[PDB]
């Protein structure tokens, strides 16, 4: 299958060179896998989700996305036009408020909620977690993401939008999750993207067009537009049978395009997520 006129980072994920505009992927499109988007929430009623998106938990009075941010991230994962995994199942966990912030204890609780929730969710192909969230270094926050990965969930996390080493940022520095940095249109690390030996992979994170609240769309930048790209690549790859929650990050790095990125600091991997689908 081929999506013609696809957002840049989708096409970049199915190509070995930059400047392409078509997105290539298997028509299975991540059916049978489920992705939990921990965040501001998800506008489940967005027609781009086609009844495949759903609010599963809030730590607030409202289970809705009154920010937009969560919706944007969930759209790069699985919306129909903007999504990597166009048929995956999306679950919303609101650990961030409408401004887009949350305390550590509530985001640790939301990670632990998925650990248990996934057992009673029909995801035959596997379960992934997308965390476009983070802050100062926390050993409880790293511990919680380690348990989540350990429960059999492919955990993808943002590197941090600081242009410094991701080692001083909370879930990012957890060595066992899949830590995602951002790249731009021209195959350069995004200027704001963190780096460090803790990163595993880079995804498109600059000028990423996706779904927004109010049944609309919006284009924004950050390690947060990059995370869900590798989160949807896992779900798609897992639904292909190529890998599973435990091995997924390793498999994505081992099959990434190598040495394509410029502006990559020494000690940081030069790997860009790739779906390996030539037609």
């Amino acid at each position: 299958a081929a999506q013609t006129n696809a957002p840049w980072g989708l096409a970049r994920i199915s190509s070995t060179s930059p400047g392409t505009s078509t997105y290539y992927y298997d028509e299975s499109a991540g059916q049978g896998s489920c992705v939990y988007v921990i965040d501001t929430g998800i506008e489940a009623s967005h027609p781009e989700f086609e009844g495949r998106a759903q609010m599963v938990k809030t730590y607030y009075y409202s289970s809705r996305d009154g920010n937009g941010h969560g919706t944007h991230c969930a759209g790069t994962v699985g919306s129909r036009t903007y999504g990597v995994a166009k048929k995956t199942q999306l679950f919303g966990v609101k650990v961030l408020d409408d401004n887009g912030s949350g305390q550590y204890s509530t985001i640790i609780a939301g990670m632990d909620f998925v650990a248990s929730d996934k057992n009673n969710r029909n995801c035959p192909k596997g379960v992934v977690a997308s965390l476009s969230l983070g802050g100062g270094y926390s050993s409880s926050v790293n511990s919680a993401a380690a348990r989540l990965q350990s429960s059999g969930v492919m955990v993808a996390v943002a590197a941090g939008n600081n242009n410094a080493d991701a080692r001083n940022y909370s879930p990012a520095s957890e060595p066992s999750v899949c830590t995602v940095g951002a790249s731009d249109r021209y195959d350069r690390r995004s200027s704001f993207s963190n780096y460090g030996s803790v990163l595993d992979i880079f995804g498109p994170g600059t000028s990423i067009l996706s779904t927004w609240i109010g049944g609309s769309t919006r284009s924004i930048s950050g390690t947060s537009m990059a995370t869900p790209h590798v989160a949807g690549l896992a779900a798609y790859l897992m639904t292909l049978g190529k890998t599973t929650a435990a091995s997924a990050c390793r498999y994505i790095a081992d099959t990434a395009n190598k040495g394509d990125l410029s502006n990559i600091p020494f000690g940081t991997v030069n790997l860009l997520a790739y779906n390996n689908y030539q037609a």
């Binding site: 965040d39 501001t40 920010n67 937009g68 941010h69 969560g70 944007h72 961030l96 408020d97 409408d98 401004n99 887009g100 912030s101 949350g102 965390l131 476009s132 969230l133 983070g134 802050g135 100062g136 996390v157 943002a158 590197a159 941090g160 939008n161 600081n162 410094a164 991701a166 001083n168 940022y169 909370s170 879930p171 990012a172 830590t179 951002a182 963190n194 994170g205 996706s210 927004w212 919006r218 284009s219 924004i220 930048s221 950050g222 390690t223 947060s224 537009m225 990059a226 995370t227």
Partner: peptide, 10 residues
């Protein structure tokens, strides 16, 4: 982290 589109982990 959150609000409007952006990203985090730092």
């Amino acid at each position: 982290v959150a609000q409007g589109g952006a990203a985090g982990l730092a």
